Amino acid sequence: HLKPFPPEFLWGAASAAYQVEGAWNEDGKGLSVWDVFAKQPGRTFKGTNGDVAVDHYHRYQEDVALMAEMGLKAYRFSVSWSRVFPDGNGAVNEKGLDFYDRLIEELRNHGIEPIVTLYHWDVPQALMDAYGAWESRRIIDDFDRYAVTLFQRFGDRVKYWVTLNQQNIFISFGYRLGLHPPGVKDMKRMYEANHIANLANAKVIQSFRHYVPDGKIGPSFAYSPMYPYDSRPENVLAFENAEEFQNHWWMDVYAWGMYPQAAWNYLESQGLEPTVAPGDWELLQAAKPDFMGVNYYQTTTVEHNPPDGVGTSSGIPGLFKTVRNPHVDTTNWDWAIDPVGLRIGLRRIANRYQLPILITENGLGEFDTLEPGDIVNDDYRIDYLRRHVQEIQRAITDGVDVLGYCAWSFTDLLSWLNGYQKRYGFVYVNRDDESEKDLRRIKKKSFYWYQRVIETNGAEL
Amino acid sequence: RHLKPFPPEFLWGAASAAYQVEGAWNEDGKGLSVWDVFAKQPGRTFKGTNGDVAVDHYHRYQEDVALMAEMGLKAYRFSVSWSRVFPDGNGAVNEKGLDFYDRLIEELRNHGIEPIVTLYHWDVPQALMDAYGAWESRRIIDDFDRYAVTLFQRFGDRVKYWVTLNQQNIFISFGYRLGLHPPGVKDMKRMYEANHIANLANAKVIQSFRHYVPDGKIGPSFAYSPMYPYDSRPENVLAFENAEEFQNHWWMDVYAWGMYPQAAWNYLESQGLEPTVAPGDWELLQAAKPDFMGVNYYQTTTVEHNPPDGVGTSSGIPGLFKTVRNPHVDTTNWDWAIDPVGLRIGLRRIANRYQLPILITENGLGEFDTLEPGDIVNDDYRIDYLRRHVQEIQRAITDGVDVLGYCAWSFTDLLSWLNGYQKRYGFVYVNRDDESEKDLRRIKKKSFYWYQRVIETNGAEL
Ligand SMILES: O=P(O)(O)OC[C@H]1O[C@@H](O[C@H]2[C@H](O)[C@@H](O)[C@H](O)O[C@@H]2CO)[C@H](O)[C@@H](O)[C@@H]1O
Ligand SMILES: O=P(O)(O)OC[C@H]1O[C@@H](O)[C@H](O)[C@@H](O)[C@@H]1O
């Protein structure tokens, strides 16, 4: 018999500041690296950018009212560092803090738990200009000063905090694939910036223990659990390599403060291991989180990759390469649909680290059709969410401590590079890639489905 | 890719177990072990074979050590028979029993061979079973500790490497779940209680070791079959998660971290099978970190989804996993997988999960060796098996696993627990069979000279 969801389960939904807020130059806000990057011609679909997005900065009262109508138990959002410190360091911007204060008060007045995410990829451009942002150890103290400011202003009202959201994405996309700022393709630089981000995460967790002694904090990891293609020993070995290189490389640092040794030795043999300073290991080991945040969309299957092989398939020669998994469904965008993979990832985190898990992001991006009468029938989104929630219930029954589930996303939002048409929200926003239209909010069918999930604490899916 | 060499102090070894080699079952004051009694029950063992004589290593140890020195062994791993040292398990120490192990250790040291002493290989004295049920009573924790401390005091000056419980998962599961080994019980609840007591005994002895052998290295040895999923079907990967945790982490997480894994614990709790925990248990288990994980390795196991009405050929646990033949590995003549890459995988998994050095305490090939005219045994099949495993160990070292040594199973042919003598494991053939001891003469197999050359070249010629 499946166990019920625990009574205080945080049924949530989530967003990110650049993707929803707009108001990119209002109330003293400084430029973020994304304000600049997205205005490079050709970088984003149809030149879409975060100047307005879905205008949540001005429409937050309506959006929170919709959350209360749904009965959301928690809303996870990120704070835009450039609103609080327009230059990254230096003078605090009270008008920027005041927006988040008003948002938090609106949530609390409706009984919704805020989950504050410190960082979703939008370091102030001034810090990139001054010292290269995440490539400089200077960012450790600047990020800590920013985080401490938020802990001081909001710790009395916010119990749950996420530090770096998807560090593995912003680091790898920014420094290895060149898809995100700063547009670099250099593995050596990637691992250096990654190490600095690890130190920044640990430093802010240490600060949190002083300023928010009753709070709960953790990083959030974009987790694609690895599978071996089959039981061929060389494919199982490729899986060992891939899970360690892609997943333990981050989560072991978060949980244990140590990089895994086989991956470290491989990077050292390539001259790619990060520079370690005295005190680094002590800091990383002394910053235990209360939970592991998990952003989940799909698993990855791997197979053996000879030393002259792949490096379609991607991988590392001599370690592993990816291969299409014939045993999982796909979305209309070729993302795998693997709800059991979420249960597997949750089981792996509990088994390896004994940590509670907050699922910070999971959802389905698809074209939605607006029908006359302001009707959006998104049964495909209900199907996807239902199947993932069902597997979470099985993970809970197995013994995993899952603190909550934040569906991605509450309203439709701006994609980093792909505009607006692949929508994720429970709430449709009437705008597209060419026009803001009237920006009106329209509840999708999935809104009412999730409302009923919450009312029954997951008993009716 | 440049392979790393075997480290300069790598323990090229071979191994045995006391009941399987010693004989002298009632000599020099030795008391009855549970195996002395069990193997004499009609029908328990093939052709009634038992350890009364075995290969008579108790009397022939000088000849056997001389062969080890001829081979150039760096280490010899053996077990101490508790019933020789404390015939009743507790009570009076038997000095003649200690004197045998003293003579053996001196013989090894005089030939430059490192002794690796194994405290327990399944032979608890029958008197402790009679009095209180042996591993089912917490009384065994202090009795085992007193025995271990006796050995630490007598031999700690000359023995650096110690193994505590050898293959706890086997003696506990075979003794209390499958009923194949003493005490012949089939009761999962009793199995998990005895297993918990064995965990506490292991931790207690490691704590004592820190007091008595401060420069030594100690660890348990686990019979490790690394699990594989059959394929990338999500339900088969989940079956693998269940199987690796339930079959492997259940033991190794206690050894390394002092904690049982939660999903397995909750499953047992739902069946009414979780062990009874006393105040102080977690503190003891957590405060007994080993210096290494010992690994007894023969093969991997591949698993697939098993519905709640499923298998309980294939074996498994309904709702968790079931085994399935792996189509991508060869098998021995007894349907055991031959999977040397699986040894590398298991070594990588232990380093990745626990960051522990590993002593491979047992690995070998059992086969029906033919004694040819001229006292020749051509066991190229054994050479091939060992060569491939040693090659994969070198790759694991190159990956970054700290492997302390490799003990081939076995040095001489020996008595199997239930299956007699015909399926042989030694580098040294022993002339006897299931019907009689013949003359017990020792005959070097071809593999003896192969391993001699491996050791001489520190693994460069395999
Ligand atoms: O509109 P898109 O391109 O589908 O983006 C949706 C969300 O993507 C999340 O990150 C993804 C990323 O898109 C993938 O490229 C990467 O491989 O996986 C990560 C896993 O999260 C972002 O978290 C979110 O801000 C986007 O809305
Ligand atoms: O002869 P069998 O049944 O294959 O057993 C071989 C070996 O099996 C191993 O599990 C034991 O550790 C050894 O003690 C034993 O010799």
Breaks in chain A (C to N over 2.5 Å), named by the residue before each, are 311
Q: Tell how far the Cα of A296 is from the centroid of ligand 1, in angstroms.
A: 10
Q: Are A339 and A387 in contact (CB under 8 A)?
A: yes
B367 C-beta closer than 6 A to ligand 2: no
**Tokens found for residue B333:** 């003549």
In this structure, the residue with its CA closest to atom 15 of ligand 1 is: A169
Q: What are phi and psi of B2, to 5 degrees?
A: -80, 125
Distance from CA of A262 to the nearest CA of B (A): 5
Q: Are B149 and B93 in contact (CB under 8 A)?
A: no
Q: What are phi and psi of A3, to 5 degrees?
A: -75, 155
What domain range includes position A63?
1-461
**Tokens found for residue A399:** 């013994």
Nearest Cα neighbor of B269 from B186, B178, B188, B169 is: B188
Please enumerate in sequence order all residues whose Cβ is within 8 A of that of B211, keeping only pairs 6 or more positions apart, or say none: none
The DSSP element (H or E) to which A350 belongs, if any, is: helix A339-353
Quote the distance between the C-alpha of residue A137 and its chain's center.
Answer: 23
Q: Are A168 and A250 in contact (CB under 8 A)?
A: yes
Q: With contacts defined as CB-CB under 8 Å, which chain A residues touch B329?
A: 233
With an 8 Å Cβ cutoff, are B328 and A262 in contact? no
Q: Tell how far the Cα of B353 is from the centroid of ligand 2, in angstroms.
A: 27
Taking the C-alpha atoms of residue A87 and residue A124, their distance in angstroms, rounded to an integer, is 6
Taking the C-alpha atoms of residue B3 and residue A112, their distance in angstroms, rounded to an integer, is 57
Please enumerate in sequence order all residues whose Cβ is within 8 A of that of B176, keeping only pairs 6 or more positions apart, or say none: B183, B185, B186, B187, B188, B190, B191, B194, B195
With an 8 Å Cβ cutoff, are B261 and A228 in contact? no
Q: At what angle do helices A379-398 and A339-353 cross, to 10 degrees?
A: 30
Distance from CA of A432 to the nearest CA of B (A): 37
Say if strands A226-228 and A292-295 run parallel, antiparallel, or are unpaired: unpaired
**Tokens found for residue A63:** 């959006």
Distance from CA of B367 to the nearest CA of A (A): 24
Taking the C-alpha atoms of residue B96 and residue B109, their distance in angstroms, rounded to an integer, is 20
With an 8 Å Cβ cutoff, are A265 and B399 in contact? yes
- Sign of the C-alpha dihedral, residues B107, B109, B114, B115? positive
Nearest ligand for residue B365 CA: 2
Taking the C-alpha atoms of residue B311 and residue B320, their distance in angstroms, rounded to an integer, is 10
Please report, for residues A242, A311, B27, the alpha-carbon distance to residue A319 in angstroms, rounded to integers and kept in the order given.
7, 10, 56
Taking the C-alpha atoms of residue A326 and residue A306, their distance in angstroms, rounded to an integer, is 22
With an 8 Å Cβ cutoff, are B328 and A230 in contact? yes
Please enumerate in sequence order all residues whose Cβ is within 8 A of that of A1, keeping only pairs 6 or more positions apart, or say none: none
List residues bridging with B162 in a β-sheet: B117, B218
Breaks in chain B (C to N over 2.5 Å), named by the residue before each, are 312
**3-state class of A247 per DSSP?**
helix
State the CB neighbour count (10 A cutoff) for residue B3: 12
Taking the C-alpha atoms of residue A208 and residue A150, their distance in angstroms, rounded to an integer, is 10
List the single best residue of B3, B228, B237, B282 to mutate versus A (max A Cβ within 10 A). Answer: B237
Q: What is the DSSP letter of A246?
A: I
**3-state class of A429 per DSSP?**
strand
In this structure, the residue with its CA closest to atom 7 of ligand 2 is: B416
* Chain A, window 283-322: residues with a beta carbon less than 8 angstroms from a chain B beta carbon: 299, 301, 307, 318
List the single best residue of A231, A340, A354 to mutate versus B (max B Cβ within 10 A). Answer: A231
Cis ω for the linkage preceding A182 (within 30 of 0): yes
Beta strands in A208-335, from DSSP E residues, in sequence order: 216-222, 226-228, 292-295, 300-303, 315-316, 320-323, 329-330
Say if strands B330-331 and B321-324 run parallel, antiparallel, or are unpaired: unpaired
Quote the distance between the C-alpha of residue B145 and its chain's center.
Answer: 20
Helices (H), A71-215: 81-84, 94-109, 125-131, 138-154, 167-175, 187-211
Q: Which atom of ligand 2 is nearest to the CA of B418?
A: 3
Q: With contacts defined as CB-CB under 8 Å, which chain A residues touch B358?
A: none
**Tokens found for residue A253:** 């640092």
List residues bridging with A78 in a β-sheet: A117
Q: What is the DSSP letter of A226?
A: E
Q: What is the DSSP letter of A7?
A: T
**Tokens found for residue A56:** 């949540």
Cis ω for the linkage preceding B410 (within 30 of 0): yes
**Tokens found for residue B135:** 């591993």
Taking the C-alpha atoms of residue A379 and residue A100, their distance in angstroms, rounded to an integer, is 33
**Tokens found for residue B297:** 């390795």
Amino acid at the residue A10: L
Please report, for residues A157, A308, B19, B25, the alpha-carbon distance to residue B57 in angstroms, rounded to integers and kept in the order given.
74, 52, 10, 11
H, E, C per residue of chain B: CCCCCCCCCCEEEEECCHHHHCCCCCCCCCCCEHHHHHCCCCCCCHHHCCCCCCCCHHHHHHHHHHHHHHHCCCEEEEECCHHHHCCECECCCCHHHHHHHHHHHHHHHHCCCEEEEEEECCCCEHHHHHHHCHHHCCHHHHHHHHHHHHHHHHHCCCCCEEEEEECHHHHHHHHHCCCCCCCCCCCHHHHHHHHHHHHHHHHHHHHHHHHHCCCCEEEEEEECCCEEECECCHHHHHHHHHHHHHHHHHHHHHHHHCCCCHHHHHHHHHCCCCCCCCCCHHHHHHCCCCCCEEEECCCCEEEECCCCCCCCCCCEECCCEEEECCCCCEECCCCCEECHHHHHHHHHHHHHHHCCCEEEEEECCCECCCCECCCECCCHHHHHHHHHHHHHHHHHHHHCCCEEEEEEECCECCCECCCECCCECCCEEECCCCCCCCCCCEEECHHHHHHHHHHHCCCCCC
Taking the C-alpha atoms of residue A19 and residue A169, their distance in angstroms, rounded to an integer, is 16
Q: What is the DSSP letter of A12?
A: E
Taking the C-alpha atoms of residue A410 and residue A71, their distance in angstroms, rounded to an integer, is 12
List residues bridging with B265 in a β-sheet: none
Q: Are A265 and B396 in contact (CB under 8 A)?
A: no
Q: Are A461 and A453 in contact (CB under 8 A)?
A: yes
The DSSP element (H or E) to which A454 belongs, if any, is: helix A445-455
Tokens 């005219």 belong to residue: B373
Which residue from A46, A416, A424 has its CB within 8 A of the most atoms of ligand 1, so it is best to mutate? A416
Q: Are B231 and A325 in contact (CB under 8 A)?
A: no
**Tokens found for residue B139:** 């009384």
Q: Which atom of ligand 2 is nearest to the CA of B223?
A: 10
Cis ω for the linkage preceding B183 (within 30 of 0): yes
Residue A241: closest C-alpha in chain B: B348
Taking the C-alpha atoms of residue A150 and residue A93, their distance in angstroms, rounded to an integer, is 12
Please enumerate in sequence order all residues whose Cβ is within 8 A of that of A247, keeping only pairs 6 or more positions apart, or say none: A221, A223, A224, A225, A226
List the single best residue of A2, A235, A236 to mutate versus B (max B Cβ within 10 A). Answer: A236
Please enumerate in sequence order all residues whose Cβ is within 8 A of that of A156, keeping only pairs 6 or more positions apart, or say none: none
Please enumerate in sequence order all residues whose Cβ is within 8 A of that of A371, keeping only pairs 6 or more positions apart, or say none: A377
The DSSP element (H or E) to which A116 belongs, if any, is: strand A113-119
Nearest Cα neighbor of B17 from B118, B152, B128, B159 is: B118
**Tokens found for residue A200:** 């920044």
Resolution in A: 1.3
**Where does residue B164 rank: exposed (0-12), middle (13-18), buried (19+ CB within 10 A)?**
buried
Q: Are B71 and B448 in contact (CB under 8 A)?
A: yes
Distance from CA of A301 to the nearest CA of B (A): 7
CATH number for the domain harbouring residue B432: 3.20.20.80
**Tokens found for residue A391:** 């597997």
**Tokens found for residue A260:** 């895994």
Please enumerate in sequence order all residues whose Cβ is within 8 A of that of A405, keeping only pairs 6 or more positions apart, or say none: A9, A10, A11, A12, A359, A362, A389, A392
Residue B240: closest C-alpha in chain A: A344
Residue A258 sits at the chain B interface (C-beta within 8 Å)? yes
Give the strand order in the sheet containing B227-229: B227-229, B301-304, B321-324, B316-317
Q: At what angle do helices A379-398 and A445-455 cross, to 10 degrees?
A: 30
Amino acid at the residue B259: M
Taking the C-alpha atoms of residue B116 and residue B16, their distance in angstroms, rounded to an integer, is 11
Amino acid at the residue B366: G
Tokens 């937050």 belong to residue: A60
The DSSP element (H or E) to which A453 belongs, if any, is: helix A445-455
Taking the C-alpha atoms of residue A386 and residue A450, their distance in angstroms, rounded to an integer, is 9
Ramachandran assignment for B438, one of left (phi > 0), alpha (psi -120 to 50 degrees), beta (any other):
left
Nearest ligand for residue B297 CA: 2
Please report, for residues B84, B138, B142, B149, B199, the alpha-carbon distance to residue B90 in angstroms, rounded to integers and kept in the order given.
12, 14, 9, 12, 20
Amino acid at the residue A151: F
Residue B3 sits at the chain A interface (C-beta within 8 Å)? no
List residues bridging with A116 in a β-sheet: A77, A161
Taking the C-alpha atoms of residue A219 and residue A240, their distance in angstroms, rounded to an integer, is 23
The tally of CA atoms less than 13 A away on the side-chain side of residue A209 is 10
Please enumerate in sequence order all residues whose Cβ is within 8 A of that of B210, keeping only pairs 6 or more positions apart, or say none: none
Q: Structurally, how many domains does chain B consist of?
A: 1
**Tokens found for residue B357:** 């050095």
Taking the C-alpha atoms of residue B253 and residue B432, their distance in angstroms, rounded to an integer, is 41
List residues bridging with A75 in a β-sheet: A13, A114
With an 8 Å Cβ cutoff, are B345 and A260 in contact? no
Distance from CA of B68 to the nearest CA of A (A): 34
Taking the C-alpha atoms of residue B54 and residue B62, their distance in angstroms, rounded to an integer, is 16
Count residue pairs from A and B with Cβ separation < 8 A: 106
**Tokens found for residue B178:** 């499958």
Quote the distance between the C-alpha of residue A84 and its chain's center.
Answer: 20
Quote the distance between the C-alpha of residue A410 and its chain's center.
Answer: 14
